[PDB]
Swiss-Prot record, chain A:
Effect of residue 102 to F: In VHLD; type I; No effect on interaction with HIF1A nor on HIF1A degradation
Gene field: VHL
Entry domain remark: The Elongin BC complex binding domain is also known as BC-box with the consensus [APST]-L-x(3)-C-x(3)-[AILV].
Protein name, as recorded: von Hippel-Lindau disease tumor suppressor
Taxonomic source organism: Homo sapiens
Span of the entire protein shown here: 61 to 206 of 213
Pathway(s) where this gene product acts: Protein modification; protein ubiquitination
Assembly, per entry: Component of the VCB (VHL-Elongin BC-CUL2) complex; this complex acts as a ubiquitin-ligase E3 and directs proteasome-dependent degradation of targeted proteins. Interacts with CUL2; this interaction is dependent on the integrity of the trimeric VCB complex. Interacts (via the beta domain) with HIF1A (via the NTAD domain); this interaction mediates degradation of HIF1A in normoxia and, in hypoxia, prevents ubiquitination and degradation of HIF1A by mediating hypoxia-induced translocation to the nucleus, a process which requires a hypoxia-dependent regulatory signal.
Result of altering residue 51 to N: In VHLD; type I
Keyword Cytoplasm carried by entry: yes
Keyword Cell membrane: yes
Curated annotation (Swiss-Prot), chain B:
Note: JQ1, a thieno-triazolo-1,4-diazepine derivative, and I-BET, a benzodiazepine derivative, have been tested on tumors with success. Treatment with GSK1210151A (I-BET151, a I-BET derivative) has strong effets on mixed lineage leukemia and promotes myeloid differentiation and leukemia stem-cell depletion.
Disease: Cornelia de Lange syndrome 6: A form of Cornelia de Lange syndrome, a clinically heterogeneous developmental disorder associated with malformations affecting multiple systems. It is characterized by facial dysmorphisms, abnormal hands and feet, growth delay, cognitive retardation, hirsutism, gastroesophageal dysfunction and cardiac, ophthalmologic and genitourinary anomalies. CDLS6 inheritance is autosomal dominant.
Domain topic, free-text comment: The NET domain mediates interaction with a number of chromatin proteins involved in transcription regulation (NSD3, JMJD6, CHD4, GLTSCR1 and ATAD5). The C-terminal (CTD) region mediates interaction and recruitment of CDK9 and CCNT1 subunits of the P-TEFb complex. It is also required for maintenance of higher-order chromatin structure.
Site (Acetylated histone binding) location in chain: 81
Entry's localization field: Nucleus; Chromosome
Tissue expression per record: Ubiquitously expressed.
Species of provenance: Homo sapiens
Whole-protein residues included: 60 to 168 of 1362
Name under which the protein is recorded: Bromodomain-containing protein 4
Residue intervals of the Bromo domain: 1-105
Curated annotation (Swiss-Prot), chain C:
Family: Belongs to the SKP1 family.
A GO term from the CC aspect: elongin complex
Tissue-by-tissue expression: Overexpressed in prostate cancer cell line PC-3 and breast cancer cell line SK-BR-3.
Principal location: nucleus
Subcellular localization(s) per the UniProt record: Nucleus
Gene: ELOC
Protein name: Elongin-C
Swiss-Prot record, chain D:
SMART domains attached to this UniProt entry: UBQ
Pathway in which the depicted protein is active: Protein modification; protein ubiquitination
Coiled-coil positions: none
Protein name: Elongin-B
Assigned keywords, A-Z: Acetylation, Host-virus interaction, Nucleus, Phosphoprotein, Transcription, Transcription regulation, Ubl conjugation pathway
Origin: domain of life: Eukaryota
GO CC annotation, single: cytosol
The Ubiquitin-like domain, residue ranges: 1-66
PROSITE patterns per UniProt: UBIQUITIN_2
Pfam families: ubiquitin
Record's subcellular location: Nucleus
Length: 146, 109, 90, 102
């Protein structure tokens, strides 16, 4: 009940872009800080959408449940539109860490039901069986208020 | 009387605790909403929280007099709001969920 | 200006200091107190190559306006790169 | 805009960027900042292709499509040591391939 969208009845009309080469899952955040999945955008496709000012959005990889950057940030909130009515969010691949990128790539090229038949340290098992979950990254951003 | 209780404790409650359900808890304030033509088109605004207040206070006598007050709000939203208006899409979601749980409905005492 | 990286098998790598420092291990080993050359006895050169490749890409594409492309990891070397990157804290 | 390449001779490699407008002659002078030997004494190849000191990095291939930061292009080097020679030095490394459970 802290990182939520305000019950706003105002127009914004945002345009998504998916400039990332992945299948983006835009997720709208409820007025109670809950993940709401919307239609997926195939790589390199952009759709003009409407929205209300004060609603909050973050993007994900629909299949590998990775995070993405909207205008170089993890979160998106609509700006002030008048005379610039189409506020525009451009989604790109985050500058991933080499560990977590390699962590992703093994998950895609191994069946997740094994993961433990690879000769790696036990600490490195719960790194790949960690899975970039949405609300997993939410708790981090709830703290990030200062 | 158990049917005016399975609606109140189970059916009402799961619908009350829904994200799109917040405006459907209080009746319209046409002056602040900037539209006085609400009462002129809608003749039975007996819903939006009024459904709850009369349900605990046993004003609905049977298992169908109360359910019909539910349909009024859903249809009411359809009547005055153009099909595909965000407020309609919210009403459609509540009605969908209402039908999902009433299909295991108990016997009326 | 540049710092050399040596592999277990022997291949020498000349990258810029700032590029390598992106690794948290190279950051801590290159001295809070204090000379600029390090060798890894378990990081093979074929793996170390992708390490310096990730560096050029880690530097080139951080908070930049130009569409950030995906990173190529060959599947056979993916396991070794995980352990190396795990060790390099990057 | 800019090409990203990597120059090799025996177990040694250099990771650096350069502009398409520069010629191969301009690159050799930068090499002397790392390996400290005159550009006259070194000769760059493009994997069995002699490079002339007049054609730009563009004019000899090396585009932003083939030589990227994530997958740089390989370009070679040899020395003469008093007279002239010492091609070619091709010096790879091999990786364990097995996909146990992949
Ligand atoms: C193609 C594609 N590819 C990739 S993705 C994608 C994509 C993206 C987006 C979309 C569609 N896009 C959305 O999904 C946007 C995005 C995000 O932004 C959320 N989203 C919404 O649309 C949301 N909608 C909203 O957030 C706003 C909805 C309001 C309007 C304002 N309102 C409201 N209106 C009214 N009327 C004026 C109607 C009168 C009436 O008959 N009423 C009968 C109920 C009694 N009356 C009241 N009441 C009750 C009074 C009141 C009281 C008590 N207080 N207040 C203040 C008032 C006024 N309330 C509350 C409801 C949801 C909830 C529908 C999801 C689709 C696809």
């Amino acid at each position: 009940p802290v990182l939520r969208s305000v019950n706003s009845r105002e127009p914004s009309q945002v345009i998504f872009c998916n400039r990332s080469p992945r299948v983006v899952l835009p997720v709208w955040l409820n007025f109670d800080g809950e993940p709401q999945p919307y239609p997926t955008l195939p790589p390199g496709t952009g759709r003009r959408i409407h929205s209300y000012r004060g609603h909050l959005w973050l993007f994900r990889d629909a299949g590998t449940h990775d995070g993405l950057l909207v205008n170089q940030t993890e979160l998106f909130v609509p700006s002030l539109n008048v005379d610039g009515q189409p506020i525009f969010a451009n989604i790109t691949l985050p500058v991933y860490t080499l560990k977590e990128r390699c962590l992703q790539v093994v998950r895609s090229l191994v069946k997740p039901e094994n993961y433990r038949r690879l000769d790696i340290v036990r600490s490195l098992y719960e790194d790949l069986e960690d899975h970039p979950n949405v609300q997993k990254d939410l708790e981090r951003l709830t703290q990030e208020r200062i | 009387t158990n049917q005016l209780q399975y609606l109140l404790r189970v059916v009402l409650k799961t619908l009350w605790k829904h994200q799109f359900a917040w405006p459907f808890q209080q009746p319209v304030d046409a002056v602040k909403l900037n539209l006085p033509d609400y009462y002129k088109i809608i003749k039975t605004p007996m819903d939006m929280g009024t459904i709850k207040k009369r349900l605990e206070n046993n004003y609905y006598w049977n298992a169908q007099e109360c359910i019909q007050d539910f349909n009024t709000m859903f249809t009411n939203c359809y009547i005055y709001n153009k099909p595909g208006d965000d407020i309609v899409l919210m009403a459609e979601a509540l009605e969908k969920l209402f039908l999902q749980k009433i299909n295991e409905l108990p016997t009326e005492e | 200006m540049y710092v050399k990286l040596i592999s277990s098998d022997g291949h020498e790598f000349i990258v810029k200091r700032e590029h390598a420092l992106t690794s948290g291990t190279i950051k801590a080993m290159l001295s809070g107190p204090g000379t600029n050359e390090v060798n890894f006895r378990e990081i093979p050169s074929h793996v170390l190559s992708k390490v310096c490749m990730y560096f050029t890409y880690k530097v080139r594409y951080t908070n930049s306006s130009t569409e950030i492309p995906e990173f190529p990891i060959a599947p056979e070397i993916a396991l070794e790169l995980l352990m190396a990157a795990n060790f390099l804290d990057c | 805009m800019d090409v990203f390449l990597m120059i090799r001779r025996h177990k040694t490699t250099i990771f650096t960027d350069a502009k398409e407008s520069s010629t191969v002659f301009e690159l050799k002078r930068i090499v002397e900042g790392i390996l400290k030997r005159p550009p006259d004494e070194q000769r760059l190849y493009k994997d069995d292709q002699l490079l002339d000191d007049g054609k730009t990095l563009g004019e000899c291939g090396f585009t932003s499509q083939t030589a990227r930061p994530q997958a740089p292009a390989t370009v070679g080097l040899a020395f003469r040591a008093d007279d002239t020679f010492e091609a070619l030095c091709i010096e790879p490394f091999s990786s364990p391939p097995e996909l146990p459970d992949v």
